[PDB]
Amino acid sequence: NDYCQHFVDTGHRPQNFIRDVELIRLKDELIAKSNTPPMYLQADIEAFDIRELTPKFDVILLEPPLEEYYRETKCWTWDDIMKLEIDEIAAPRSFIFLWCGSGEGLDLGRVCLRKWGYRRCEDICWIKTNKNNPTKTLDPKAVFQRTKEHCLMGIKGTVDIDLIITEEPEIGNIEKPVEIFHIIEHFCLGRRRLHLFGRDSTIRPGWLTVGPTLTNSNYNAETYASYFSAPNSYLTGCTEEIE
Amino acid sequence: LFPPQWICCDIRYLDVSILGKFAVVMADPPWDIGTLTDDEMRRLNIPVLQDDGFLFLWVTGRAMELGRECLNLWGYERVDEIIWVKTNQLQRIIGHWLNHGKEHCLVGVKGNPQGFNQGLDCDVIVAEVRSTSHKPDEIYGMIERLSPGTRKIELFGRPHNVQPNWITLGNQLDGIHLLDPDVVARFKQRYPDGII
Ligand SMILES: CC(C)[C@@H]1[N@@H+](Cc2ccc3c(NC[C@]4(O)CCCN(c5cc(NCc6ccccc6)ncn5)C4)cccc3c2)CC12CCC2
Numbered sequence: 188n189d190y191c192q193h194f195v196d197t198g199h200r201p202q203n204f205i206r207d208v209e210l211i212r213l214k215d216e217l218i219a220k221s222n223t224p225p226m227y228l229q230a231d232i233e234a235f236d237i238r239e240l241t242p243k244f245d246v247i248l249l250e251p252p253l254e255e256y257y258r259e260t261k262c263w264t265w266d267d268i269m270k271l272e273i274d275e276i277a278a279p280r281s282f283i284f285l286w287c288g289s290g291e292g293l294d295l296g297r298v299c300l301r302k303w304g305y306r307r308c309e310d311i312c313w314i315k316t317n318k319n320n321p322t323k324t325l326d327p328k329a330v331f332q333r334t335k336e337h338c339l340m341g342i343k344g345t346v347d348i349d350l351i352i353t354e355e356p357e358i359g360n361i362e363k364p365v366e367i368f369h370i371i372e373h374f375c376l377g378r379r380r381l382h383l384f385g386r387d388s389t390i391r392p393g394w395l396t397v398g399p400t401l402t403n404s405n406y407n408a409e410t411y412a413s414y415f416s417a418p419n420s421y422l423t424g425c426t427e428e429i430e
Numbered sequence: 431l432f433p434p435q436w437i438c439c440d441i442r443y444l445d446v447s448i449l450g451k452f453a454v455v456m457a458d459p460p461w462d463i464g465t466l467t468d469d470e471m472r473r474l475n476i477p478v479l480q481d482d483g484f485l486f487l488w489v490t491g492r493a494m495e496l497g498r499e500c501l502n503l504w505g506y507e508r509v510d511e512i513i514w515v516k517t518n519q520l521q522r523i524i525g526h527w528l529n530h531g532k533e534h535c536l537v538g539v540k541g542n543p544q545g546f547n548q549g550l551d552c553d554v555i556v557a558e559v560r561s562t563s564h565k566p567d568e569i570y571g572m573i574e575r576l577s578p579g580t581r582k583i584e585l586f587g588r589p590h591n592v593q594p595n596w597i598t599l600g601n602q603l604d605g606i607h608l609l610d611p612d613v614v615a616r617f618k619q620r621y622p623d624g625i626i
Contacts, residue, residue: 189571191568191571201552206520206521289553307494307495310494314513330509334554340528350523
């Protein structure tokens, strides 16, 4: 069966036909007992001195609002994103997960990762199904219909698959699948976790969220650093808390 | 000449100027991740093969970056990226951090191609794994719907890749099989004793 021919026939994307799309439970519980209280801070990140965010972070999730997320609807250009001083708040060993979209971000987002000093180790793909709606408006450069987004993973310093399959969100809904959070937390990369350009709807235990549209803030740098003072400085986030 | 054609050779040393221009070029290189070093991939004479059209370039691991390098050095802008979701015969899905469910194929444009059927397919392939290192036949159907009847050239193909309207080059092909008269003409002129 040629699903590409089938999509040309019927408007059903090939990913519509992927099927199915342990001890993992215990690891999830250890993550959940390990998680810091959620913390969040409204900040216009264009105008915001990033260095106020301390301590340096083990994980950075970066979800800038690309103009392409608003097909039928302040956007950030890759120009703006590349100027963020991401390297000033990243720990010497740390990880970045950058949502790149499906256009020039696949290239420009790689330039950022190198500019901030990371090498890319994984290319995580959000494949969007259209089971509930067998039509697209193409970017002028596009050769094919774009049915996916890329979240690039980066490492600097010394269980899950690289696919997320969900149904295409409603027009003007820009949320990324919450599955990206499970993939991250399962890596057990440390507990200082920053989500840049989060929203009220993305706040989450174990995470600090900073964004222009947050309606409330609770961030205090000294309180936040208190969660990781000894004897907690190096926990993976997947181990039992120290008494 | 519409039926399959091929040239067993070393793509490093073949004078590809004899082959003419192609609406589509596809390459599935053996990346140094019988491989080629990175300088041998940069120096491949891709730029002569096309004036206007598309390049399909499979990549993996660090050739994800390096293939973007060759792609740009060779004169292309990357305009799309196809991913193939690997399944079994029952449509379930099959890098030291995450398990890999896909292979990547960069899509690059050169010049100004006109009369192509952009938008017909979508950038995801779902299809069953065949041999090791064996790309899915669906890409040929997508490439034929995008640019029907035009000439296409595949670099680093194996015998199973030979397709109508395509000229396959690779060092595991059986001999030289050429039917287009101009290609036969330029091939005998440049290679009178049939040795490359
Ligand atoms: C996602 C992609 C990236 C992944 N690809 C990986 C892949 C691609 C092709 C594979 C293959 N191709 C057949 C070859 O002929 C075999 C030999 C090498 N080569 C050459 C080289 C050459 N000059 C140098 C030279 C000559 C002589 C002696 C030394 C050096 N001249 C002509 N041909 C190609 C054969 C076996 C495995 C391959 C794996 C596959 C994908 C798509 C799905 C995954």
